[PDB]
A paper describes a structure:
The [name] protein is an accessory gene product of [name] and SIV that is dispensable for virus spread in experimental ex vivo cell culture systems. Thus, [name] is an important factor for AIDS pathogenesis. To achieve this multitude of activities, [name] has evolved as versatile adaptor for protein interactions that lacks intrinsic enzymatic activity, which allows the viral protein to affect a wide range of host cell protein sorting and signal transduction processes. We thus chose a strategy aimed at wrapping the surface of [name] by the combination of different, physically linked, target domains and the iterative optimization of domain composition and linker segments.
Attachment of the cytoplasmic domain of CD4, however, which is the smallest unit tested, turned out to be suitable for in vitro characterization and amenable for structure-function based binding improvements. In this study we engineered a 10.0 kDa protein (86 amino acids) that binds to [name] in the low nano-molar range. Indeed, we show here that the binding affinity of a designed protein inhibitor to [name] is increased from 250 to 26 nM by fusion of two structural elements and further lead optimization. This fusion protein is the tightest binder to [name] known to date and supposedly covers a large surface on the target protein. Thus, a protein construct was designed that simultaneously covered three interaction sites of [name], wrapping its functional surface sites to render the protein non-functional. Unfortunately, there was no electron density visible that would unambiguously account for the CD4 part of the inhibitory molecule. However, the resolution achieved was sufficient to show that the N-terminal chain of [name] in one complex of the asymmetric unit was bended away such that the binding site distal to the PxxP motif on face the F94–W117 gatekeeper residues could become accessible for other interactions. However, NMR spectroscopic analysis strongly support the displacement of the before mentioned newly identified N-terminal helix by the CD4 segment. Mutagenesis analyses showed that the CD4 dileucine motif is required for binding to [name], while a C-terminal cysteine-rich motif, which was shown to form an intermolecular zinc-finger with the unique domain of [name], did not contribute to the interaction.
Author numbering:
A (entry chain B): 80 to 138
B (entry chain A): 74 to 154, 183 to 207
The structure:
Amino acid sequence: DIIVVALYDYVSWSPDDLSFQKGDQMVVLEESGEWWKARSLATRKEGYIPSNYVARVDS
Amino acid sequence: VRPQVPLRPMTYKAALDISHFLKEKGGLEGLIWSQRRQEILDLWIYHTQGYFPDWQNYTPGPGIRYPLTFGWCFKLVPVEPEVLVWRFDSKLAFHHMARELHPEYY
């Protein structure tokens, strides 16, 4: 799996986008655009996230 | 203390979803319109969520200004003291006035 760490807080206003908290670990599911679909290893909730707020980790 | 989220093309559901988010958050329904006040709204979204700010357009008047982007569910209503007020209408979720009165579409 490709993992990312949240370099900032993001708040979604839409149930399609995945609000996350800085330091959260997410699994990317789709890297299609500048916005990526991911899943929260914490919450198991999915959504789209702004890719410039995350940092890829080779962990 | 946060970057500018990548830009992304707006869409019925985006409009719809934003429409909901503000309706709920309150402080818009029955607010007096302005060129500026709209720009503040409209900027904060581009900044926050990546939707450029060229979607919140409305039909010319005089009378109720109906929104052009299907899914935005806020119309600009004139009241008595012509001054305009942001106003929510669920019917707008499904009824696309602007396209009725008149094709700036296709």
